[PDB]
């Protein structure tokens, strides 16, 4: 029943989209980060400054220790915990309970951060990333096996107020127009092949291997669009070339002052569109996902004011090109593990004041790009 899963996420890009879960007997309720960039299901198992509650194993009659521990490191942050299994109910999705592996965290560094509302994480990537090894079955593989659902899930983020995680397929009411699919290049992270980036209709002129040199991945657990240093610099250079920033004048005399705007005025009309080309499942064809300034020049303030301050939602990476929440907020994203593909459709909830903040278009030809851009 996919309609019941509509709006089962809360949160925002900045600190995470999370799913409520009931764990153990009697049920303990937790708030769980949705992360397509890792493969472990782990919950706080002891108090922490930045969480309200944790999972207490001694209060669950169905919990079983598996007899070993585990440590997981992310690009930033890490934790160590014990490994067992227990019954989980997802109230907004599956009213039957299923048995899953669970890591109960007792130590962490730079993981539970101030401002979060989640106390656990749902790693939705492939078994090859799971710790201590790929034989520790993932949450979603247990689910597929036990609820006998299709090996597919899909995500819509409505923060451009929550979103939806549809486990087992696609929900038609969550998109408009066509789904475009790009092949999964390597089943670990959700690695896809990027052919080209275009800023205000001008392609960057980098070898396409630059976009993938490490890997290009789709990751709901990352807030920003994260670009390898060379790619980042080429982007911001193109953005400076295509933007039309106001000149300094009365009341505007430093660059910092560009951040905040009054009187319903916004910075968006001054900035170019940003497009990512992906190979289609038909190798000779590509499609383009496009974000408008509305998605990468991001409003910051709490409610109740009559000015707004914005931040740039693109940052450099050392290694990976990470399609994080900055971009995912523009699209309904389909993780079609059964057919080794990732799908994108424009989100209806990705609208500000009636207007679309993202676009999808194709096909384009791949005739002038290498047959493989992943080195």
């Amino acid at each position: 029943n996919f309609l019941a899963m509509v709006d089962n996420l809360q949160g925002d890009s900045g600190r995470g989209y999370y799913l409520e879960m009931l764990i153990g007997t009697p049920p303990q309720k937790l708030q769980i980060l949705v992360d397509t960039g890792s493969s472990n299901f782990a919950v706080a198992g002891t108090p922490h400054s930045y969480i309200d509650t944790y999972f207490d194993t001694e209060r669950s009659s169905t919990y079983r220790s598996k007899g070993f521990d585990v440590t997981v490191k992310y690009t930033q942050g890490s934790w160590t915990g014990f490994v067992g299994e227990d019954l989980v109910t997802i109230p907004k999705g599956f009213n039957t309970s299923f048995l899953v592996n669970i890591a109960t965290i007792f130590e962490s560094e730079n993981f539970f951060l101030p401002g979060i509302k989640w106390n656990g994480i749902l790693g939705l990537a492939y078994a090859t990333l799971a710790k201590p090894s790929s034989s520790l079955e993932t949450f979603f593989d247990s689910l597929v096996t036990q609820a006998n659902i299709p090996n597919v899930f899909s995500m819509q983020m409505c923060g451009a107020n929550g979103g939806s995680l549809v486990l087992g397929g696609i929900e038609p009411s969550l998109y408009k127009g066509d789904i475009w699919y790009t092949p999964i290049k390597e089943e670990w992270y959700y690695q896809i092949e990027i052919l080209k980036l275009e800023i205000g209709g001008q392609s960057l002129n980098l070898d396409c291997r630059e976009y993938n040199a490490d890997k290009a991945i789709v990751d709901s657990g990352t807030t920003l669009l994260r670009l390898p240093q060379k790619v980042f610099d080429a982007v911001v250079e193109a953005v400076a070339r295509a933007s039309l920033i106001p000149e300094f004048s009365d009341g505007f005399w430093t660059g910092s002052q560009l951040a905040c705007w009054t009187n319903s005025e916004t910075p968006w009309s001054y900035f170019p569109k940003i497009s990512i080309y992906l190979r289609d499942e038909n190798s000779s064809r590509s499609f383009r996902i496009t974000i408008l300034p509305q998605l990468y020049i991001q409003p910051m303030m709490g409610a109740g004011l009559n000015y707004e301050c914005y931040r740039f939602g693109i940052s450099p990476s050392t290694n990976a090109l990470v399609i994080g929440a900055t971009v995912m907020e523009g699209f309904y994203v389909i993780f079609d593990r059964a057919q080794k593909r990732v799908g994108f459709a424009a989100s209806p909830c990705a609208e500000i004041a009636g207007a679309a903040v993202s676009e999808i278009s194709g096909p384009f030809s791949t005739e002038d790009v290498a047959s493989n851009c992943v080195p």
Partner: antibody, heavy 116, light 112 residues
Framework: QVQLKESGPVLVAPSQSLFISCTVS????????VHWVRQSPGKGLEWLGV???????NYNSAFMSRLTISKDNSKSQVFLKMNSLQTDDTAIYYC??????????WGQGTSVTVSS | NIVLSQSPGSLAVSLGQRATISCRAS??????????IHWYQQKPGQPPNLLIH???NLESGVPARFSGRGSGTDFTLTIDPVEADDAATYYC?????????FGGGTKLEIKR
């Protein structure tokens, strides 16, 4: 053709006051800000402040205690007045046209020496 | 104050070759992905003159031999190929925060 011309006292005694004018042509002060910058061997290039089209002034805080910039749109002139002169105020003083998010046309500069 | 530190203090480059000079800011100069820092050339007996606006935008009428790169705190100005007329001191200047400030300059010596 844009032009800026500083006129100042070539020599001024310490603790006395520095007054420099900037006469501009080829653009209007009703439309463009004018900045004051100085250059010395001891301190290099230092931005002193600016007067924008609408008459608003913003200053380098290190100098705000003793610097006043003003203008008279009808005379196409911008002015700089600095008090409590110290010998390291010896510098070349430029007026400079505002342009986008920086500065484009500079005057030739006027040499100011602070000495008794 | 945001401090700008330029290196090297002096560089000697042969005619026809590439010169690359660096500017380092004490704090990021970026807002909205734009770097509020600019490059100026000062020839002897002249005021400085803007070459590169917002880190990488070449000023109209400046030869294409001049180029600017960078983001955050690290910027470079590249002149390639260097010509005799390029003998001058180059300055970076930021205005992401007040006061606007200038780097200490880099003198390019043409190595004839």
């Amino acid at each position: 053709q844009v032009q800026l011309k500083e006129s100042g006292p070539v020599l001024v005694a310490p603790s006395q006051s520095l007054f420099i004018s900037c006469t501009v042509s080829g653009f209007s002060l009703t439309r463009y800000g004018v900045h004051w910058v100085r250059q010395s061997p001891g301190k290099g290039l230092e931005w002193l402040g600016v007067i924008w089209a609408g008459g608003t002034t913003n200053y380098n805080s290190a100098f705000m205690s003793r610097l006043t910039i003003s203008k008279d749109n009808s005379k196409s002139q911008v002015f700089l007045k600095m008090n409590s002169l110290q010998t390291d105020d010896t510098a070349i003083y430029y007026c400079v046209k505002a342009y986008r998010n920086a500065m484009d046309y500079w005057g030739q500069g006027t040499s100011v020496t602070v000495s008794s | 104050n945001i401090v700008l530190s330029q290196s090297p203090g002096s560089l000697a480059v042969s005619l026809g070759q590439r010169a690359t000079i660096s500017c380092r800011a004490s704090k990021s100069v970026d807002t909205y992905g734009h770097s509020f820092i600019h490059w100026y050339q000062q020839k002897p007996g002249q005021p400085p003159n803007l070459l590169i606006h917002l880190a990488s935008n070449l000023e109209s009428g400046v030869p294409a031999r001049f180029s600017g790169r960078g983001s955050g705190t690290d910027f470079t100005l590249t002149i390639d190929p260097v010509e005799a007329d390029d003998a001058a001191t180059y300055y970076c200047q930021q205005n992401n925060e007040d006061p606007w400030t200038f780097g200490g300059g880099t003198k390019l010596e043409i190595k004839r």
